[PDB]
Design a protein around this ligand. Structure first.
Ligand SMILES: [Ca+2]
Ligand SMILES: [Ca+2]
Lengths: 121, 119
């Protein structure tokens, strides 16, 4: 457990508002976000995601699509995915982490991501 | 990214893994980050991320065996999506590999993109 850990918690796939980490960031600080876990964005068997986004479907390429884990800071969204390494924070605000899904389509989701946030020098 | 010491692919069909050529000594601290989709079989079921295989129908959403692992000093270590600030436990060269059953790699597909950083 590295001593520069500043937050460790969960992001619920069903929560449109995301998790308020309570980490008050200032522009220019450098942080690292790391994530893992399985979340479903629907009831169908193919409706699975990791922090890095949804799984390839029938006949698709094994490539990454839009990340499912994102950060919200100052009313703007930033991709996170499995990891955002040495991110120079662009604005002052409190960090929120959220699962990306369509407006009013969150409540058939399932699962959670485990996310860690570290302060970097 | 200034401290990036290696970047490359880990092919899911390669039982020997990727020899990164990164020579490590005990005590050194590295960070390993990974992403991507790979198949460990022919079926729709048989999909993995660095954090291991996908849950199947009726299964809980738990993380299972990490598909991306590291070999160093004759021991294997889980990596998954990320191994942050790892204090290298033994001298040697870093190998990164996709975890599958012996003699079961031929029906795999895809690769993980991996970055390795010096801390
Ligand atoms: Ca949904
Ligand atoms: Ca296989």
């Amino acid at each position: 457990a590295s001593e520069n850990l500043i937050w460790s918690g969960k992001v619920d796939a069903k929560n449109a508002e995301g998790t308020n980490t309570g980490v008050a960031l200032k522009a220019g600080e450098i942080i690292t976000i790391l994530a893992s876990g399985w979340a479903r964005n629907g009831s169908e068997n193919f409706a699975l995601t990791a922090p890095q986004g949804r799984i390839p479907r029938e006949g698709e390429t094994l490539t990454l699509r839009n990340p499912s884990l994102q950060a919200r800071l100052g009313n703007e969204n930033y991709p996170v995915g499995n990891h955002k390494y040495r991110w120079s924070v662009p604005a002052e605000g409190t960090l929120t982490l959220f699962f990306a899904d369509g407006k009013d389509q969150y409540k058939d989701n399932a699962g959670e991501f485990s996310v860690e946030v570290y302060r970097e020098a």
